[PDB]
Amino acid sequence: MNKGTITQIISAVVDIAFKDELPAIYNALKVKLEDKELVLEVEQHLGNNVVRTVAMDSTDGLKRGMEVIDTGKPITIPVGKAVLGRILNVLGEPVDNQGPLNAETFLPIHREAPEFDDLETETEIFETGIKVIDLLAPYIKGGKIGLFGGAGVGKTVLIMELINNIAKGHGGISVFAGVGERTREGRDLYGEMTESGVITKTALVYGQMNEPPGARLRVALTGLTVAENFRDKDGQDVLLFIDNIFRFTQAGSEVSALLGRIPSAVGYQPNLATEMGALQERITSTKSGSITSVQAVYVPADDLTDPAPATTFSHLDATTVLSRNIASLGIYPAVDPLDSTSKALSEDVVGKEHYEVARKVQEVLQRYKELQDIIAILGMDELSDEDKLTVSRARKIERFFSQPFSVAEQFTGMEGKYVPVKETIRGFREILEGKHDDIPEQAFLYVGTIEEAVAKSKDLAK
Amino acid sequence: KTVLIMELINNIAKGHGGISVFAGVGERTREGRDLYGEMTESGVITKTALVYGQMNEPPGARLRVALTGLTVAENFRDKDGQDVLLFIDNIFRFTQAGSEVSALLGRIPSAVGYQPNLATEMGALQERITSTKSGSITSVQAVYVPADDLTDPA
Amino acid sequence: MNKGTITQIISAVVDIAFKDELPAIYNALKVKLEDKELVLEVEQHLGNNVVRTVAMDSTDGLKRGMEVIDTGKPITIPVGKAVLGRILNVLGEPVDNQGPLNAETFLPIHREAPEFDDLETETEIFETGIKVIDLLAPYIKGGKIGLFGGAGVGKTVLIMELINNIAKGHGGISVFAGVGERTREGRDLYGEMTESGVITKTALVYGQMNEPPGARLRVALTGLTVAENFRDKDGQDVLLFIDNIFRFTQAGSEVSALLGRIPSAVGYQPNLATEMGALQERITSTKSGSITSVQAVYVPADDLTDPAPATTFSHLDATTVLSRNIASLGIYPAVDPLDSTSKALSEDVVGKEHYEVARKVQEVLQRYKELQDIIAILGMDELSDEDKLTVSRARKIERFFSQPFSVAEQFTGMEGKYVPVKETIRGFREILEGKHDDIPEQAFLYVGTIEEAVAKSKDL
Amino acid sequence: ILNNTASEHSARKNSMSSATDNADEMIKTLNIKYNRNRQSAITQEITEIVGGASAL
Amino acid sequence: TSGTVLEVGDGIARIFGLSNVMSGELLEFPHGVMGMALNLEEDNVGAVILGNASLIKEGDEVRATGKVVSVPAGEDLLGRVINALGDPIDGKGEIHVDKYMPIERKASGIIARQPVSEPLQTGIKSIDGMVPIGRGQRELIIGDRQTGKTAIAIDTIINQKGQDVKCIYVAIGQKRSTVAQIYKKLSDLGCMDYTIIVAATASEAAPLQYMAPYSGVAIGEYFMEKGEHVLIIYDDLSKHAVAYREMSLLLRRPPGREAYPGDVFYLHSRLLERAAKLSDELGGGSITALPIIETQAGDVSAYIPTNVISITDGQIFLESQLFNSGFRPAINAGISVSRVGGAAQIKAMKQVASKVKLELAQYTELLTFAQFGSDLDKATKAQLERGHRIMEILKQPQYHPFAVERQVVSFYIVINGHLDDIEVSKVRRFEKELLDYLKANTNILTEIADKKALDKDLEEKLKESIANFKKSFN
Amino acid sequence: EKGEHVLIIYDDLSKHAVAYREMSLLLRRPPGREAYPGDVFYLHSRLLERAAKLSDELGGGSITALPIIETQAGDVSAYIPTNVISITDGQIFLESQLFNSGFRPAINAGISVSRVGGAAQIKAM
Amino acid sequence: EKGEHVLIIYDDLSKHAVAYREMSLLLRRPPGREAYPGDVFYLHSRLLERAAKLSDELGGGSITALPIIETQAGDVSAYIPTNVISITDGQIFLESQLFNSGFRPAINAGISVSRVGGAAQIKAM
Ligand SMILES: Nc1ncnc2c1ncn2[C@@H]1O[C@H](COP(=O)(O)OP(=O)(O)OP(=O)(O)O)[C@@H](O)[C@H]1O
Ligand SMILES: Nc1ncnc2c1ncn2[C@@H]1O[C@H](COP(=O)(O)OP(=O)(O)O)[C@@H](O)[C@H]1O
Ligand SMILES: Nc1ncnc2c1ncn2[C@@H]1O[C@H](COP(=O)(O)OP(=O)(O)O)[C@@H](O)[C@H]1O
Ligand SMILES: [Mg+2]
Ligand SMILES: [Mg+2]
Ligand SMILES: [Mg+2]
Structure with missing residues (x-):
């Protein structure tokens, strides 16, 4: 069904021309590349029955006029309990080996956020163990928590402590989402997860530095899609940890240029606000369940006026800012006690x-x-x-x-x-x-x- | 600077004779009615003509409103030959209106995103505001300073 | 001769169309005017057998559809003894009104840098014959020296002596590249060069501010080519003065702007590093000889982090800072002994x-x-x-x-x-x-x- | 009184010497902060001008 | 099929035709110059020229090779000087190669790697002392212009002699004067035997500078896949980035922070990810990376420095303050870190050198307010003396690395407090003569090297031998 | 219009502007300063002007407007913050230097002004 | 050319540049730093150079140039000031701090320079 041909390629973006029917936006296309197949995602409808698509993997090898087939649905992923204790790809594939998944249900990546009135108002804190946080900026159950930090001020370390304090000795389900950070940390964590024994209850998704832009973009969602399933289907309280959500918004800018969009301030994509809202509003505690999200935000050149960190501030119930001045002074955790605030x-x-x-x-x-x-x-x-x-x-x-x-x-x-x-x-x-x-x-x-x-x-x- | 103009009118235009002309170029409409209120009670209204084109008005209006108020004053100095006082608030908004449209007229933006013909556009309007042999006008035109920055082109 | 025709003219840049054969990049072109023939330099190929060029002189007079003659080679300049004590144009022409040049060898301005095995791998210290320099700011053979100066602090005197000291002291000859030179200070230099009697023991190459950006860019290389000859052909050390290197850097961005390239950080050319390297890698010590170089550096807003001096500092081996405080005290040469530093x-x-x-x-x-x-x-x-x-x-x-x-x-x-x-x-x-x-x-x-x-x- | 005023000025020599040294190093950091912004201000200016022209 | 150039300029080309050409396919232009097919548009093909673009012009024929851009990798390269493309620079004949490997290649997954075990020893007392490196680690060498950045890089290559470790020093945006003198020094000392030198110098075109580090690691992959240990040195990335910036802006790609494009992070992130230690499943090989970055007036909170810091596994700061003060290598212990830690370090080393790091950081804070209190505590005065002495030990000269056995004793001397009575002046020679005493006589150095730990006996055995030398000294 | 008093609140115009930026740059209306389009003044000018008090002839019904703006590290020289300040009939400045100091609500009297003054005050006040 | 001595005064080149900027930007010529074309240095160089002293052989006359340039808050590193300074033989720096202090004309000796110097002075002076 719905088979097309590649007209032109441009690094991480590919333009495909369909003869008959044209695929809806966010649909998953597949091309038979040498040995292994490549997955593409349609974005724009150009004209003359042509569509512009962003690749989920390296485009090196693609010739002009190659065959490509439409799935029809968006990129759907194995979702549910099958994924627990196994590291997943952007496409939803298992990259840990240990057989195929026991996937029963499936669910698409792209789905609208919870509407107003489906949301719930809860304002109860929970002690993290960390003195500066518990006093000044206490985190909120079912809330969106933010960890702002420059290059190497101990924001990943802080996450690893928070999962160790909260998710370690508690019965609730957990979710981790590696987005454009170190692949070393992936192995380091996966080992520390198994040996500790937290692996069982928690689920992992990874799309790190090595991965192309398209991958780093969409991994942020798949992990969230998994986290959504548990608050919806099972109706169970879940924890979501992301590192680093900046790398998602960053990937956008790399792609946006190729999509032909006019760049805004500091050469970012002009749809920075909505592209982020369409994700961040999806990470929220409903009536059916409750998600406590703790996501790290990289601040480029320690510049918080930068539009990527700047806009994220308005998606958070509690925020913990990490200052280099504090870290340099020889104090950890390097939490600014004045700039950090919480709604609670x-x-x-x-x-x-x-x-x-x-x-x-x-x-x-x-x-x-x-x-x-x-x-x-x-x-x-x-x-x-x-x-x-x-x-x-x-x-x-x-x-x-x-x-x-x-x-x-x-x-x-x-x-x-x-x-x-x-x-x-x-x-x-x-x-x-x-x-x-x-x-x-x-x-x-x-x-x-x-x-x-x-x-x-x-x-x-x- | 708006309050200062209001005082200068109260001091000069009220006491002395001759006509005057106020030009509300792209400032608050509230202030328009506030002036018109003070003008009629003071009895200056009779000896003055008011042209307006405030914030709420689109670009084209805020652009060419200054020329309307100017053209009224031009007449009074030449044709009539009486002493004229031209008050303008604000003559920045003339330039501003220019910049809004400039982009869509196919003009490449110049330093700190202004129209490239900033000096000549202003020069064409400013040189026109002057006293001559046939009669003299006293131009008191308030100028906005974007973010208190005097290095700003405008 | 391969011949073409002009398509369009926009100030400095000129687009030219050929029928049969298309000239390679950096090839010299020529259009005939009644006054004097104008030299252009092709930069890129556009399409439809058209190429864009930058003029080394003004274009006030050119019509569309004029005859243009491809030389088929990058602008070549005369070298050797014929150049000594002569003032040279960027195109190798004389402008000192001292008759024609009778050079027997011609090397192009654009050429690739010395290869790996050719370079002498030994830190041979260079003595100028001055106490303050040789001791505290030791020069190196095939080195790049920063001459932080300007104004009346005895700069041209220091240069004229350094030229005289290598000529007398060793079997060496100097070259001077006036990148963005003042026409006034050009005459006064040539004047004081003949007065001191050093004129013969050096080569002069001026590219005035008067001339367009294309000229100021390539004039730096003209003198470098003359110095290249004395090291390559003859087995002797050389001393290539450049003043000012920033006027070479800035000429580059001026060109890059005209060609309509996207400006990089701080509005300089995107090819700041390569265009800088292309010149500075040429200045080095071969087994056959060595080109040492004393370059004057402007530093915008007294900022060292600024890309123009920053990328320049990459190549610099030592620096010599003239102080007005020491010059006013009555100590010549000035040369601040603390500010001045060296690798050697x-x-x-x-x-x-x-x-x-x-x-x-x-x-x-x-x-x-x-x-x-x-x-x-x-x-x-x-x-x-x-x-x-x-x-x-x-x-x-x-x-x-x-x-x-x-x-x-x-x-x-x-x-x-x-x-x-x-x-x-x-x-x-x-x-x-x-x-x-x-x-x-x-x-x-x-x-x-x-x-x-x-x-x-x-x-x- | 001679000892006290002799000591006073010797003490004032110390406080002001360190004050000068602190100021000297503060000026350095600020000069770098200035040039950091200088560079940024020039870059941004051009980005907006190029961005406006190229969009056209 | 095939193609012809219809437009060229600034190292970028537009090609007509090429029906069956693929993304990033190596091309072949006349006069021996080559390029990489970039933008496969509907009506034309884009290409980045990997050489002098002067020699190519409109009309010239272009033939697609059929293969992706790749570098010739082999075991013959060891002791040769190479360019970005893979051609011989040194001038020691042609290069016979086993494999042809791609420059651009996605890094390994999560389970494909394992935690690092064995250390990589730079041979410097300060580095291997308190900021250790592991085989598979990525450690940044950050500092201003001329602070002994490359010095530390080459001294590491030197110390890899007789530890079965290959070396790859890739020179990006350098001058050949530097690269050639390094080749001469390494060959004289006899460390060039097992070392490759990739070169894309300042003269060479930006795309070659862009290509160089990828070529370097691709040759490093050859040895890793077989199952060997490799060292790669990017010197430097701050030049590499500018090279890439030049390309992007000429390709009309929108500029970002400091005119650097949006994917200047992905430029270095995907590069350094390829440096790691694989699991035993894939053969227990490793690629250890030492990238370099050049800060402007110690501005570590600039765009690229932060990019690189956030992708590496720690960093090594080098201040001009320390360097110009006369303390080389001018390493700042207080700031510098290594994320691997004591997982890849010798027991003996951890026993002596672990205490130092924090003491140095405090030491400097004690020095600052030593100005004020004309008199100070006598217990604190002793720490300053210790601090002065331990710092003098951490200072070592260039082209002279130490073995781990020699480092252990060097620390043991001062930290235990057998050097407290010895004057600060002649502390450097006191170390030299003591190791020479232990070398010939007691042969305790070989005891440590093999054992790799100080037990109850050997610790007291060491204390006996030094007590003899103490008396012998005059 | 019916002749009733209203109090509208915009939370906040600094974000409102970014949305208009999105629209424009996608529609290919060219960028200006800080990438914002030409008429980001006119955007907020026509909105805020809409707030007024009508004469007794048209009811005497009001509609008071309290727009909000979000500064970046106290940067009021920024394009939108400066735009809005010049439109409104005064402003209220909040500084974290006071807020953290324990002065709530953290109002800076120095910069905060009301262009209506005591005209909108009870005589006792 | 008739061997006479001339004085010419450009008041000012900062206004002149802006006039040339307009032309270039409307002709759709590629902009540079502060939206100036690449040949703005070339513009001023070929003007200022044309003012000099000829030899005795060519009459012996001269044209002396007094160009003026307006700085914004003492910005000498701006694109036109920096490059016009580079062209000229010497510079006369004025400061408002001196002007307000009562110094007339408010000239800063320390930074003011004339590279010609003693050559253009009588023995007495
Ligand atoms: N450990 C050391 N002991 C003594 N001298 C040293 C040491 N390390 C470096 N030097 C000296 O310092 C100089 C600069 O060192 P190096 O070139 O390694 O720094 P760099 O930052 O790489 O320089 P650049 O940035 O110019 O490439 C060299 O000439 C070298 O002789
Ligand atoms: N809580 C902490 N206690 C002690 N040291 C820390 C702490 N957090 C960070 N560090 C130091 O700073 C480094 C940076 O940690 P990391 O989480 O990688 O920062 P980021 O994720 O912001 O790059 C660590 O390697 C460690 O040496
Ligand atoms: N003569 C004055 N006396 C006291 N306050 C004044 C005077 N002029 C202006 N103000 C203050 O400034 C405000 C009005 O300023 P305005 O005239 O609107 O300046 P602008 O036109 O620059 O906005 C008033 O709220 C008032 O507090
Ligand atoms: Mg991290
Ligand atoms: Mg007003
Ligand atoms: Mg180096």
Whole structure:
């Protein structure tokens, strides 16, 4: 049925001419390339019964006038429980070997997002274990979480800790989606998943750096399509982890040029807002089920005004910004406590003490940041006695936010310490009130509890 | 700068004799009625002619409205021969209207995305606003400064 | 001769159509005008047997459908002894009004760079015969030197001496490429070249700002081709001056703009790296000879990160920074000893003695520049007791770097002074050690060897 | 009083020496930040001009 | 069939016909120059010329070879200088090859790889000390102009002598003066035997510069697939990117950040992905990559530096501050990292050198406020002395790498505190003479090399031998 | 029109503009500054002008407009933020330097102005 | 040519460039930095060079050029200023900081340069 011929090829885009019937948009085409077949995706209808298609794999080898067949439906994927504990392709194929999948049901990649009124309003937090996050920017169950970070400021590390804290010792289903990041991390994770035993409940999809643009574009969806199935069909709460969602929006720009679209600011595609909305709004908690998504956002050249990171901000309930200034200062996790915010931080949700303390440390840290200009050129001795005490407390609070990570145990050589929400608020309160003014600032780094902070101060004295 | 023009009218045009001409070139329509209110109560309305083409109006209007208000003033200095006061607010919006359309007229954009014939378009209109031997006009024209940047072409 | 016809003209660029044969890229074309024949250079093939060209002169006069003659080769220029002491056009024509050239050899301007095995793989140090340079900013054979200067800081004097020192000192000949030269400063250069009597010991190639962008681009290569000949044909060292290299860089972007290419980062040509490399890779040390080069560099907005100087700095081997502060103080040549730096300043290259001397000299000079804040306002008296002995050395060191120049003879009256490296080392080595501590600092001013420095103190 | 004022100025020498050094290094970073933006501002300017012409 | 050129300029060509030509197919223009079929349009074919585009013009015939662009890979290449295309540059006769391998080839999947085990030793005390590299790792060498970037790259190639590891130094946008002097040095020291040099220098056309690194890794694939260990060195990528930028802008592809096209990330991401260690299923071979990148005034938060940092497995920062201060190799321990870690490092090495990294970072912070407190704590004063001494040990000269056994002892000296009484001045020679003492007499160096761990006995055995040398020293 | 008071709110025009950018660049209406089309002023000019108070002759019915704009690191020199500021009858500035400092709502009195003034205030106020 | 000495004053070349820019951009000539064509340096070079002193053989007359150029917030690195500076023999830099301070004409000696220098001065001076 519906067989056509290739008119012209242009890197990652191919133009095909159909004699009779023309395939609808997002339909999957197939060409019999040398040995293995290649999958293409139709995008535009040009004219003279011709369609412009983006390839899902390398186009090297394609001649002009080759045969190509329409499937009719979009790219459909094995979906359901069959996929669990197996790494999947962009096309939905298993790349882990270990036989073919036990696929019962199927479902297309491209499908409209949940309409208004199908959505549900839930505003309950959950402790991550991480002090800076749990206090200032607490994550929300069934919410969209965002991890903004420049090149190598510990955003992938942070994910690996969050899956280790949340998805490890909990009964719920999980989903991971590798998008245009390291293939090393793929093997590293798949090993750590199996040996830990989380592999069983979680499902993996991968389309990494090595993969062409078309692949990196659509992998973001397939994994989401899998995550959608569990909140819909089974009606079960699922977790979705993506790294890195930027690489999806990035791929767009590589393709957009070839589709002949007029470039917008910083040579991005002009449909950046909608192309991202058509994905991001699909990642949401409905009535039928609930998805808690935690996706990482790469910031190119540490430039958050860049339109790719800029637009993503307006799709998130909680956001955790990672600053290079903090990482360089030698503090991990390198979380900016002022730039990072969450919708849940309100008396309604977190209570009185949580909110009261959270706003107080922000006020102190803000004042430290204000005076940081003057101190840089003159010194600490010049600023008034009133400021002097607030600065000294700020530097301790700032360093207390640092704590060792279980994933980075091999790195740091320290037992990563999970701190509960109630013991964090206790700590930042005692430090603020000035009951730990006697303790040095070098007794707060990579500690955890405040009880352990004083233990480090006594360890010195010996 | 709008309030300043309003004061200059209140000080000069109200007290002194002769006619005047106000040209609302692509600014707030609210302010139009606010002037017209002060004009009629002060009794200056009789000795002044008002031409308007505000924000709400399309490009073509905001473009050529300045020329209408100018042409009224041109007449009063030459034909009539009386002393004229020409107030314009704002003469940036003339250029702005130019830039909107410029792109669609097939003009390649110049520095900081203006029309390439910025100097001549303005020069053609500005040189026309002047006193002559046959009569003199006192032009007080407010100028917008995009983002407080005086290096901006306009 | 293969002949064509003009299709369209837009200022600098000209499109030309041929019937039978089409000229290869960088081929020289010629159109006949009553005044003078205009030379064009084909850049690309468009289609329908049409090719686009850039003019080396103005196009005010050209009609459509004019006869054009394909030379069938990239614009060729005369080389050898016929070029010495002559002012050359980009096209190799004379413009000094000194009769015709009778050259017996012609090499094209466009040619590929020396191959891998041809290059001499040895860091042979080059001595100019000047103390400050050879010690602190050592040149290299087949090297690229950055001449940070401009304005009245004795730049053209330094160049004229460097030309005279290689001509007398070694069996060498110099070349000068006036890329975007001022017509005023062109005449005044040729003037002072004949005055000093160095005119014969160099080749002059001017491509004025007056001429179009095509001219300024290729004039850099014209002089390089002349230098290429003296290294390739004759077995001798060469010294190729370029001023200014940025005017070559900027000519490139001006051309790239006219041709209608998409501008790269900061609005420079997309082929900034290759077009830069094509020239600089040609300047190197073969087994047969060596072309050393002193290039002046403009730095836009005093920015080093700017692509034009940044891509240039890739090729640069050493740098020589002229200071107005030192020029005003009355120390010639100026040559800031701290700003000036080199690849060649290392034990592996020059030697252990040479190295540790230069280091100590700079550390003391730095310590003087630190205590320059105090002595300027307070005085030499109002200072620490221990540093004053090291300051008294530093002031003598800086004044010892002053050097009588052969080219200056006409003005100063004093005879010149070439100085090899071993003579300088000993001189500076003794001063910092503290043998000639008793010698006044006024004796060191404008003297050659340390032997002559102590001799002048008794004279005074 | 002589000792105190002698000490005063010796102390002021220290504070101002470090202040100057801090300023010197602050100027460096800012100059790089400036040129970073300079470069960007020129690039962007051209992108918009080329982008406008090529679209036509 | 076949084709003819109807339009050419700026290293790009338009070709008529070529009915049965495929995407990225090698082409053959007259005068020996070749290209890659790029844009297979309806009425014409696009091509990127891989050489001097002057020699090609409109009218000239073009014949499709039938094969994808590929580089001649073999075991004959070892000790030869090659260009991007694969032709001999050195001038040591023709090159007989077993295989022809493609330059552009998708990297291996997830299960096709395994965690790295065995280390790759650069032979520098600082690098192998506290920022170790594994066979299959990707480690960036980032720094300003002239900070000993290439120095570290070649010193790694040197140390691979007598460890059965092939080397591929691909010179992208360099000058031949540099490439030739490297070829001369390597051949003199006798490390050129097992080393290949790919060259697309500044003179050569941008497409050749674009091609070079892909050609380099493709030759590296030859040895990996068989089941051997390879080292590849991209010198450098910041030139490679500009080369690709030149092409893209001449192809009229829309510019992005700093005029670099949208797929300048994918340029390097897909390249470096091909460097990894395969599983035992595919034969336990590896390609270890050392890419280089040249920052402008230490601007590591520029477009490309961040691109490359985000695809590599860590990086090595080199400051001009340290370099000009007289500390080479000028490695910044506080910033530099290696993501593999102690998985690929010797036990003996981890026992001594693991403590250092953090101590150095703190050391520098102690130096900064040492200005203020005219007097300071005496326990802290000891750390500065240790810090001064340990730093002097980390400083080593060029073209002189150390064996792991020699590195172990070098660290053991200072970290245990047997050098505390020794003056800072003569610390470098004190190390030299001590290893020479242990070499001939006690032969404890060979004990470490074979054992690869310090046990209860050998640790005290080492403490005895140094105590003898302490007395012997004058 | 019926003669009732309305309070419309646009949340937010900075995003509204980006949509119009999408439309234009797809329709092949050429780009301007920050890739925005020619009439992104006129876009918001005709919308905001629509808000007014009519005379007593046409009911006296109002329609107050509160547009919102999203600045990038406090950059008000940007194309759209500056556009809208010049259209409206004043503006309200919010700075995180205050918001984080513990001053909510974080209004900067210095830059914030109302071009109607005390005309729209009770005498007591 | 008649051996007379002339003074010519261009007021100013910054306005002149903009006039040439207009022509080029309307002729659809490819734009460059700040939307100027490639031959804007060439435009000014062939004008300024045409002002010089001839030899005694060719009359002995001269044309002295005083071009003026307008800088925006002291931007000397802008495309026209930077390149017009490069052409001319010397430069006279004026500053508003001096002008407002009461210095007239507000000339900055430090940065002002004349490469001709002493050659164009009488012994007395
Ligand atoms: N470990 C070292 N010890 C002593 N000298 C060194 C060392 N490493 C490099 N050098 C010296 O520093 C100079 C520059 O080193 P190198 O060329 O490796 O840096 P680079 O960043 O690669 O330079 P470029 O960017 O110009 O290619 C060389 O001349 C070399 O002699
Ligand atoms: N939580 C942490 N604790 C200690 N070190 C960290 C932490 N996060 C990151 N790092 C350091 O920074 C590096 C960057 O981590 P990564 O997650 O790869 O950043 P990104 O994903 O942003 O590139 C790590 O290799 C590690 O050395
Ligand atoms: N003479 C004045 N006295 C006090 N405030 C003024 C005066 N002129 C303007 N303002 C302030 O500025 C606002 C009006 O400015 P406006 O005339 O609209 O300037 P623009 O025309 O530049 O927008 C008012 O809200 C008022 O607070
Ligand atoms: Mg990551
Ligand atoms: Mg107003
Ligand atoms: Mg190097």
